[PDB]
Symmetry: D2
């Protein structure tokens, strides 16, 4: 019933993917969805310099995560891991861990690169952290038919939606990438409501 | 409701574990639980010359997997991957993958090693394959309190149950190892019924 | 000084990538390079049916691997792992392992998908096995400039060269993919000769 | 010739390990070995209120890494990843990455956990980031005979040395753990000189 899209984005790609994930989840009758971001970690001046890019979404507290039946995580990659900011966040979830606050909750993840390299490693290495919390890990497999389209460069994997930002940052999530993101949101919100309800 | 425990074992360590997993699964009302092994790959002469171990469990067909709501997979490690016989078996699931036969079904893995090294990577890189079928991956987290006991050597991870066989093979699964295994069976069977049901 | 390109290919993509890897290695003055394949695992009739595709390269024995200063491994993916055939092969390397035959030798890997999904997981999960043998693992990082080209669909990652076969198998390794493959071969053969010499 | 031991430690477990790694590295003639820590990320008030542990080691700058031939990285796990402070630090290596400053340099990782769970994944997902800089990743395999001893609880994997801290933090690195650590330092220092030299 309650789905949190929790994300970090520096230049807006993950933010755009997050809104798409939220759209899809919102299609599920019975699903309350909220979008939030993790605290920034680099100093604000440097940030801004930098820089990229102010966000509407409120910053989440670690404690809030207990209020949700499913959490969908988005990070850009940093050399094939989650971003330091998302890492710093998850590192504050000890209290939650000790009480088993997130145990058995649905977790899914989406990311952004690149150039594309690391997009898989970023997701799967995020899953690891989620597993330590005993979260139920939900990949998207091959239901989104766009994953078979190799006629255009295209993010997205069976592990979760992804987007390709361009080495430059100038690319925007394509319709096909967004379509997969939307599918991710709808699927996990559906499974959440099936659970949940 | 239908939970399959599908395993490979050469010397019976995983076999003992599978039984424990099935034991746990059977504590759940409404869970039909069945235990099957994958085909041995080495010619019967070499197996006997190195062995045993002869197994009671029926051998599974790839097609069968479609008939279950949840599948719990066990393998000894081979240098930090699933065994070649588990790999060979899963390589036969192309038909299933193409029709979406395992999509959304619950999956969980347990393994056995050495010595211990590679026990995590075995579970984690098995998850990868399950994610390609779009299976919902279920880790065990730290519900099983035995995971905190560092006073004796002990298999078991938040990713799934493990056992430590010894360089010899001479170790047997300890009470704590089997306790975690039972837990893994009990939990995914419960989820399976909650899904499913 | 001695570089083995060890591969499995069913429909020729990895075979084509392997020859490219070999080309690149062959550019290194002082580098003896040989190309071999691992035994087929599926029955020959079925194979052929199937089927795809007869190879010039001789099939390697596990023992031979000790004769080399560097081994470059190629597999197609099977749901984000190495192929069962490559797995079966590596599973025969126990004797080598026990003597430390491959300890400290250079290892690198390249793969084929898809559609693209699993290309990273396939490489990194192969690295695991190589690490159990204490092989020195060599990724290619971002030296091959083609990795920045997002204007055409393109395999290859910092983990190792890859190729995209098309869901169909109809794609052929593109010039850019081959160029990265060639770079992989030249780089690890270079490092081999630096070692070696 | 120049080997950097670069680590994060909150309670000193990794710190003790780093010293052991440096100890091992120093047995190699021609190896200049230096030990540095990454910046603490939590404000000094919270650190003190939870701590210590105050560290003798100089704090490293991202830029410095360019000055070394080999870098050995240590981190406590955070739910199966590198720590957020190690992540934050490596996220500052963009300049290095862009100029190819760490390309081809030797890399190796060691960690610390719990409890044990996530010790492999921590090393393995650190490798991912190193591979993006095109570092030559060096696992330890099974040269260190202590890796066979399952008669006492014991950190250490073929991917790199580990120590088990206890749920308490109250465990100290055991003689065998440190022995593996020393080995890891000794081996990568030797390779570094062989490269380098
Ligand atoms: C230091 C750091 C490391 C990065 N490493 C990679 C990586 O090696 N592979 C890649 O494709 N992109 C890499 N990038 C790019 C980011 O993943 C990319 O800019 C991000 O997807 C942008 O998404 P956002 O707008 O949501 O912040 C890196 C960026 C930074 C700042
Ligand atoms: C080819 C092969 C590779 C192996 N690699 C490892 C490994 O690197 N790490 C480890 O701890 N044990 C390793 N082992 C030990 C097996 O994982 C062990 O015998 C198995 O867990 C026993 O399970 P079973 O009795 O159910 O067959 C290996 C064994 C074989 C034959
Ligand atoms: C059963 C099996 C599983 C496969 N799984 C995947 C995977 O899910 N992702 C993907 O992109 N391709 C997958 N494929 C495609 C193979 O990786 C692909 O056909 C191979 O790269 C062809 O290379 P080759 O000509 O060297 O054999 C799979 C193929 C088989 C037969
Ligand atoms: C936020 C956080 C997450 C942690 N996650 C794990 C983990 O899941 N598994 C584990 O065994 N220990 C975990 N621990 C324990 C730390 O890894 C342990 O305290 C560390 O290894 C001690 O090393 P140090 O003394 O060098 O700081 C965690 C600790 C913190 C604070």
């Amino acid at each position: 019933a309650k789905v949190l899209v929790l994300y970090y984005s520096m230049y807006g790609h993950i933010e755009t993917m997050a809104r798409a994930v939220a759209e899809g989840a919102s299609k599920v009758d019975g699903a309350e969805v909220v979008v939030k971001r993790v605290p920034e970690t680099m100093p604000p001046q440097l940030f801004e310099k930098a820089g990229g890019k102010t966000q509407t979404a409120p910053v989440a507290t670690p404690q809030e995560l207990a209020d949700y039946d499913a959490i969908i995580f988005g990070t850009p990659t940093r050399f094939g891991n989650m971003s330091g900011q998302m890492r710093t966040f998850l590192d504050q979830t000890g209290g939650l861990w000790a009480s088993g606050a997130l145990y058995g909750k649905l977790a899914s993840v989406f990311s952004s690169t690149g150039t594309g390299g690391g997009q898989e490693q970023t997701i799967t290495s995020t899953w690891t952290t989620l597993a330590h919390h005993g979260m139920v890990i939900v990949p998207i497999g091959y239901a989104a038919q766009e994953l078979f389209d190799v006629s255009q460069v295209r993010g997205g994997t069976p592990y979760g939606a992804t987007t390709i930002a361009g080495g430059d940052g100038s690319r925007q999530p394509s319709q096909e990438e967004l379509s997969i993101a939307r599918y991710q949101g709808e699927y996990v919100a559906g499974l959440a409501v099936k659970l949940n309800g």
